[PDB]
Amino acid sequence: PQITLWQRPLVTIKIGGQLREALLDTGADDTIFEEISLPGRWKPKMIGGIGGFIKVRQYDQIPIEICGHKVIGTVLVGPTPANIIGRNLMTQIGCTLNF
Amino acid sequence: PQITLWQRPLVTIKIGGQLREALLDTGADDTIFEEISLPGRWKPKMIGGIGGFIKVRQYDQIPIEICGHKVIGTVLVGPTPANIIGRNLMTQIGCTLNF
Numbered sequence: 001p002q003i004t005l006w007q008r009p010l011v012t013i014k015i016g017g018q019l020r021e022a023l024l025d026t027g028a029d030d031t032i033f034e035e036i037s038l039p040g041r042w043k044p045k046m047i048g049g050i051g052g053f054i055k056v057r058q059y060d061q062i063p064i065e066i067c068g069h070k071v072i073g074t075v076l077v078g079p080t081p082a083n084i085i086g087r088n089l090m091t092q093i094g095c096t097l098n099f
Numbered sequence: 100p101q102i103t104l105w106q107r108p109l110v111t112i113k114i115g116g117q118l119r120e121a122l123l124d125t126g127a128d129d130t131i132f133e134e135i136s137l138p139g140r141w142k143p144k145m146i147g148g149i150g151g152f153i154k155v156r157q158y159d160q161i162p163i164e165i166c167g168h169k170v171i172g173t174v175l176v177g178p179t180p181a182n183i184i185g186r187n188l189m190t191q192i193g194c195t196l197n198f
């Protein structure tokens with residue numbers, strides 16, 4: 001579907017049996033969620049943002065449904081104020097920018 | 100044109116007679132530049148993001164050229180690690196997300 005930018009580009013996604021809304025963020029290399037429960041092993045990691053850096057957990061090969069699209073990738077879990085779908089996953093649903 | 104997301108979506112801009120590269124950021128409501136010199140008055144403002152918040156100057160009605168597209172809008176200047184073009188200007192050039 002095509003989405004204009006008069007409003008924040010929110011998408012509904014399913015991950016680990018949980019439902020959430022996330023922002024399609026072309027300005028984000030990675031995908032991060034605020035508190036969700038994911039299983040298994042992860043690794044420590046720090047993300048750099050506009051206001052500074054945050055410490056997150058890094059999970060790989062995590063199944064994720066973005067607008068009905070099934071894909072798998074690396075998902076970070078950390079203290080973000082907004083759930084974000086990054087380029088690492090937007091690339092997987094074929095999402096592009098147009099103008 | 101069309102822009103896939105395998106690489107950060109950078110565009111070349113001209114603003115205040117100065118050249119810069121910026122990220123087409125669908126996850127940003129506003130446009131922010133680190134160190135550029137803009138004329139005129141401005142109003143202090145704070146912006147939030149991953150990592151915390153930062154104090155920035157808010158200039159309105161600033162002529163800016165984005166990939167050859169001449170438009171005008173609010174531009175923030177402040178301690179940001181990367182130049183960002185927000186939704187406030189992306190809508191001006193008719194930029195959309197597609198998948």
Ligand SMILES: CC(C)c1nc(CN(C)C(=O)N[C@H](C(=O)N[C@@H](Cc2ccccc2)C[C@H](O)[C@H](Cc2ccccc2)NC(=O)OCc2cncs2)C(C)C)cs1
Binds near residue numbers: 128129
């Ligand atoms: C619900 C409430 C919390 C919300 N507020 C907002 C409005 N806000 C603050 C913003 O749009 N804020 C923008 C912003 O930082 N956006 C950010 C996402 C975000 C949104 C909301 C809250 C926190 C983070 C997203 C931006 O693309 C920044 C740009 C950037 C790139 C390189 C270096 C520094 C910065 N990119 C990143 O932070 O990349 C790192 C990563 C971000 N997410 C996963 S990895 C500013 C640039 C204007 C949206 S949702």
